[PDB]
Ligand binder design. Structure first.
Ligand SMILES: [Ca+2]
Ligand SMILES: [Ca+2]
Ligand SMILES: [Ca+2]
Ligand SMILES: [Ca+2]
Ligand SMILES: [K+]
Lengths: 146, 360, 146, 360, 360, 360, 146, 146
């Protein structure tokens, strides 16, 4: 956090524009208000998704470090961290992220591509510390990203 | 109730008179054409055929005058019987008197016989002026449609403000024939305009008065390139060429609405096209995701084993696959947003139906 | 009523088009339906109007002689009978056709035109059989049409 | 409340001079037209009237100068009394002073008496610069129109932030009847541009003066046909030809939406035409169904009793009838879909009326 | 259920025949554009080469005739199998018979071996007429596409009640990428039209029969300029250049819609632009208000102190600040009022959502 | 969090290098034009000025080499730091290698010293190729604007995702003020095209290749008129004039958006004008009714006694005022229908507000 | 039913596209859902018409043989079987298919076409096995088609 | 009030146009009616605002002298009286016209402009008769305008 004073002032200006209330912090109701002001139809479910995906430490609403880090994100044009989400997002036929690893591997390792015969399944099973399988993105991410 | 029968008889008589007017105008223009070109093709020593043609055209104009007088008398009779009065003189007024006098003097002019193929370009002006009879055609064609006779059409026009008397047939013809008559008129005007242009250049052995040489500049005058090899600079030639140019450039601006309508796309097939675009994009996205994961696993393979130039190339391939995935996702998002947008009429119909069905 | 048989058939065809029901006679409700099918927003007041001028003898709905006579009307392009209707319409400031004849004459005989001094008022008063004045179009029409 | 009366007096005084501006425009034109025609169409020996013409036009320029000074004084007085100040100096500023100087120098440049009928080089450039006074018409017509005079118009416009200052009169003049004004503006400028084209091409019978062969070149360039029979070789002639061509091609734009607007098609005739097509289409469908059923029944006798080529011809006719039936069905379906759609305004009005009438 | 398999086999055979037709048309066009060039290039003493070329052309025409007969026979076969079929001679559609006879006679005419070059102008008319074979590509291209084979395609399209006989492939191709093939066609037609004009402009010694010279006077058209460095004096040249001019005028209306479509402006960009405008305008309003208040305080401070010429400039500064404030306010109102009511679809969607959420 | 600072520094360096790139391109074109002008005007080989100029332009190209090398290297550095990686050539700009090599060889080619006016095209082709440096304008202008630098704008644009890579600055510039730059561009490219047409056409006087004569013809081609006074006989001249003609005719499709939606007529003036016409038509109808009633009374007065020519004239005047009343009525009806039926947005907003206020 | 395996797979793909649920079979509610997704305003009456005209053996919803046969139909561009359907609907003035055969024949055998005098009526009466007349398309179809 | 008779008649015509009722005076309900006829969505709060600046002496609705004076206003293109209104509205962050004078002066005397150091604050404090400060536009207007 070695931001220069001019950049601190610029980000403070941005935060002031975002925070219409200024008690320091706009609340979810006026998050939805400004979102619909931009011209999007708001839903309470998606607003809850927004707030509980941006908030941390259970403080609620918005926080200055939280805003600073989420603005540290969404600036890189491309990456291999926040764009590999699809690798577990798209193959969830059930959609809750609890579909069997063996079944998804078998059904998705044949779309014009073939890799091995159950060796990939064995490797996936051994990758998990507890051998959970199913949809366990922690071990897969630990193996892939680093 | 006899007014209805009287009006029907008046309209029938008007139709007959309009038909006779059109056919006699055709005979007159045919006689004028026959008299023309005789000096430049043939010989003047016959001394009888031209006299017979002139006398026949004189009788034709006399009968045309008589039928025009009869038609105007019948229409003023129709006006009188519509506005029920008992005075012959009260029907006439300034406007109709001016109109009938103008029609008479238009018909009044007539190329009459006086008693090498060089007519002097001054004695044929009256014969050339017979083209003015073109305005007598719309009056006949509008009434000759027969749409006015159907009582049901007038009934439906009632209980509403339409007052269809003129431009109504034009609108109906444009609706039923967007360009069918337009193309024919545009293609047929060229012969007449070349024929009327080949009068001022009628100079003996000038290589310009002939019809074949004449029918070269008008197509390019209607066009825009107009390099102008002929460059005719005779008397009134500048006015004639300017008129041809202005009418041509006015007529250039068309065909755009009809070609757009023909190339237009109906919503019925648009729906199924969007549906299949959705399914194809889903297939493409699944294929891209499979490619991404397949390339990703090999990186961990080379991480477990020794890394090398192959591992570096596979990293490059992984980046390329990520870029392709992003492109496919962006395109699918664009198409989905587009299809979700618009759809105004169907969505409001559905929402109003739901509101009606909600009741209490 | 000397209509020829062919014209009788043509008008019968028109009547068949107008009468969708064919019990011989469409009713005010489906008068409104067809009128809105022509694309005019219907009001019950104007439908009751339409029907109460078109109907005669208290028969209701529509009648063949009534249909024939109203189609005998609405065919002449112009006249001096059905267009002079406004002479008692445009000068009804109250709008009920019961405004004083003297007042309307005084207020409307000065719009860039002058005719006499109370001679017109005396003539109007004498024209009425009972000297009603106000808006009595019966005597005016009697002295106008014939 | 004397401010309103003083403002009305100021506007009356401004009207008293706006008309005289265009009144003196006539003698401004006469400054150049008569001198230019006389110097070339007659001998130079007519030196007894040149001095009188010069003194008269000098007096005219002096009168125009006084008129402009008076107009500017009255308008700055209006500005002062509107702002409700007292100091004379505070009213003036840089912008209006610069405008005053520009107007003075525009009207200041006038030909003056110096003391074979050939105009030496550009000795008439000062008279040519007088033609710049063409931008006086829009201000004069804006201030002369009575729309700004009425109090009710400003009263209504005040509550809607309309700012009656400029371009409102232009918008209304375009709205009331666009065709006549634009046509007149396009037609009038041809004479002026033809007149100004011959500024140095007169020479001495060089076949480029006498105001002839110059009224012809400009319309040819405007029509974009470009015959190119003769081309002005002078640099000034070249640039004036280029600018008249670019302005002609600029004016060529538009002038085509007028026919589309006139050929409009309102709701009432739309609905009556749709009713007409509906009855025609059901009649055609009934006729086609009768035809196909009669053909099918006719097929039965040859089905029962075999023959030669009769069954074949009957089958051919049956197929033709089926094809015609399909065509009629498809066309009717298209028309029904079209009439069902594009009813958004009427449908929403009807549904909102139904919702209002539902109540509880 | 064997009808499905029979139709699939028929479609596969039709695809094979269409492919062979296209490739043999390519062979025919390859055998063209050499017979004409051989006479004009070098000499014609090698009669064996021209004899072999004519023999090969005859064989190619015979094979094209055979394949066309096979294709149309299989089309008749599929049409016959579609309906209740008994005999080969049953259907034999008369219009289809006329079409196949017309196709035969179009293919019937062909250059033939008869037994100082450039072939003059009389002979080889049939050889020059082989350009008419261009009509085959539109028939082959749509059937070449595999969209017809997809069962899901017609399955979903059936419930929409739209026919897929023709022109929907063209609509889909236009929708996929407008202008893509349009630009290619426009750039490729020039070579063909120059080549066909070369024969009309062919001359023994004049500098008009060369391909390079012929390649220039067509591009002068379709540019609406027409410099006219050369003029085609041949009547066939006249009609062909008139045709090129009219087609160029027709095609000049291109790219105009798609450039605007590419230069469009989506709702997201307009929303962020309005956000930028809001922030910038409130900032500018605050700055202007501060400026005008500070100027007013400056004037008030210098009212009672040092009352002299120095304080005069402050009043003009105050008026300038007031005018700037007025302009800023007017612009802000102008844009805010427009953007408030700009949203219609989103506004009514929100309104109906609120109405639904209201419930009871 | 230092990635933000590193990216900001990289963007600042990229902007500085883009500015220096534009400066060096300007220096290069300035050095190139002067040699071409000097070799043909003034002293041909009066001194070593030509050698000095060639050396200077060689040094300028040498600096440009390293300048674009640094620019692309910093772009690759930005791409490297965007993706967390620890390898120099892991990205290496695989596909972009072709682009960077192509741009390098475009910059690499340059006029070079070899060691009367006899200019040769072979030695001047490299100098003529310097016009390709114009490609740098978008790259410099994209970084010139400071919108990309602001963090709050990217903050607000993250939601409702819109990528900002390209065409966004063009859209903003077009929407801010469409009329600012297109006219300047059209006026500016004329000088460049005239100069490039003058180059490689100055054989030996011959009234060709000089700037003055060649500058005139290009605007004629752009205006799409043509005169044919002089044409470029060179094949390079032919292709360059064809290119100028095609770009000019492409540019003619313009000013349509300048006139439309700019000569528009918005809600406020529409409403006040409708009120204006409403009251005016009310007054006109009242006047017409008064006139017709007065004429009726006049007819009564001259009907009670002395029926004569005066009574006939009064009947004529009554029939005159009748249907004039009807014309006024019809016009008022048309206007009232148009005003009542065209209110869509305001009417739906009012009806939805009424529905919301109804509650239960 | 000798369809080739590749075409079986293609039709299985089509069936998978049609059956979003995949219990093997979408139900009438989501038939209407997908139909309105195609952009048509649905009515329960027309949905019931669809489902009962497509279903057979009382199984309900959709069936694989039923789907196969109705896709065997709707592929022929023209025919004399499913296009002669109008011959018994266009002449049903009452609209329920129970209008008298003699009356319809008399009223529809005169629109610019004349065949015979009661011979057609006698033939129609004799065609029916029970002489039902009225609207009995079974006998007419058996006589005409084959 | 030296208006001439012709101008009196013209303004009476304008008043007749404005007053549809003619009891002499339209009421706030039909003020809103005509305002929405002009095409503006009306709110009761803004209608009450309008009427309670335009009305005087508690007479209500509209008055002829009130109409005359408000039309005497809004005819000057620009001035220094009715345009300096923003000087006390643009700096009211709270928006009720009761924000502290010292605070607003401190926060708004730095937007790229600087005048003095507390001298302006002392002058503003001394300008008020009672030293109210805050937002007291009476004293400021009396000091500035005259
Ligand atoms: Ca806050
Ligand atoms: Ca009935
Ligand atoms: Ca299922
Ligand atoms: Ca009142
Ligand atoms: K054009």
């Amino acid at each position: 956090d070695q931001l220069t004073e001019e950049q601190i002032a610029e980000f403070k200006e941005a935060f002031s524009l975002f925070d219409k209330d200024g008690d320091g912090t706009i609340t979810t109701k006026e998050l939805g208000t400004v979102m619909r002001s931009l011209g999007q139809n708001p839903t309470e479910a998606e607003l809850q998704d927004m707030i509980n995906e941006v908030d941390a430490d259970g403080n609620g609403t918005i926080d200055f470090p939280e805003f600073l880090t989420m603005m540290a994100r969404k600036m890189k044009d491309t990456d291999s961290e926040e764009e590999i989400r699809e690798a577990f997002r798209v193959f969830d036929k059930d959609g809750n992220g609890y579909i069997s690893a063996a079944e998804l591997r078998h059904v998705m390792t044949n779309l014009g591509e073939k890799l091995t015969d159950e060796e990939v399944d064995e490797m996936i099973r051994e990758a998990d510390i507890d051998g959970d399988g199913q949809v366990n993105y922690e071990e897969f991410v630990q193996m892939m990203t680093a | 109730l006899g007014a209805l029968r009287r009006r029907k008889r008046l309209l029938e008589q008007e139709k007959s008179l309009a038909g006779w007017a059109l056919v006699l105008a055709g005979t007159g223009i045919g006689l004028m054409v026959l008299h023309a070109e005789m000096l430049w093709f043939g010989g003047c020593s016959w001394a009888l055929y031209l006299f017979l043609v002139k006398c026949t055209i004189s009788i034709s104009t006399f009968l045309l005058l008589c039928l025009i007088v009869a038609f105007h008398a019948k229409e003023v009779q129709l006006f009188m019987t519509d506005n029920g009065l008992r005075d012959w003189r009260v029907a006439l007024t300034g406007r109709q008197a001016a109109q009938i006098v103008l029609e008479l003097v238009v018909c009044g002019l007539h190329p009459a016989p006086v008693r090498p193929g060089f007519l002097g370009q001054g004695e044929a002006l009256l014969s050339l002026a017979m083209l003015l009879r073109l305005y007598l055609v719309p009056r006949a064609v509008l009434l000759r449609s027969g749409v006015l006779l159907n009582a049901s059409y007038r009934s439906i026009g009632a209980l509403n403000q339409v007052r269809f008397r003129h431009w109504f047939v034009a609108k109906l013809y444009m609706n039923t024939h967007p360009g069918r008559l337009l193309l024919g008129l545009t293609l047929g005007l060229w012969l007449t305009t070349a024929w009327v242009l080949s009068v001022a250049e009628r100079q003996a052995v000038n290589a310009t008065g002939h019809l074949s040489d004449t029918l070269w500049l008008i197509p390019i005058t209607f066009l825009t390139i107009g390099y102008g090899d002929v460059v005719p600079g005779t008397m009134w030639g500048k006015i004639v060429c300017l008129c041809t140019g202005v009418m041509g450039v006015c007529c250039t601006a068309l065909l755009v609405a009809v070609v757009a309508r023909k190339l237009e796309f109906n919503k019925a097939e648009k729906h199924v096209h969007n549906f299949m675009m959705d399914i194809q994009y889903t297939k493409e996205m699944k294929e891209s995701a499979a490619r991404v994961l397949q390339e990703a696993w090999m990186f961990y393979k080379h991480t477990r084993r020794k890394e090398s130039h192959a591992a570096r190339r596979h990293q490059r391939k992984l980046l390329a696959a990520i870029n392709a995935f992003r492109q496919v996702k962006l395109k699918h998002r664009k198409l989905r947003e587009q299809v979700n947008s618009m759809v105004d009429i169907s969505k409001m119909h559905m929402i109003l139906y739901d509101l009606q069905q909600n009741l209490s």
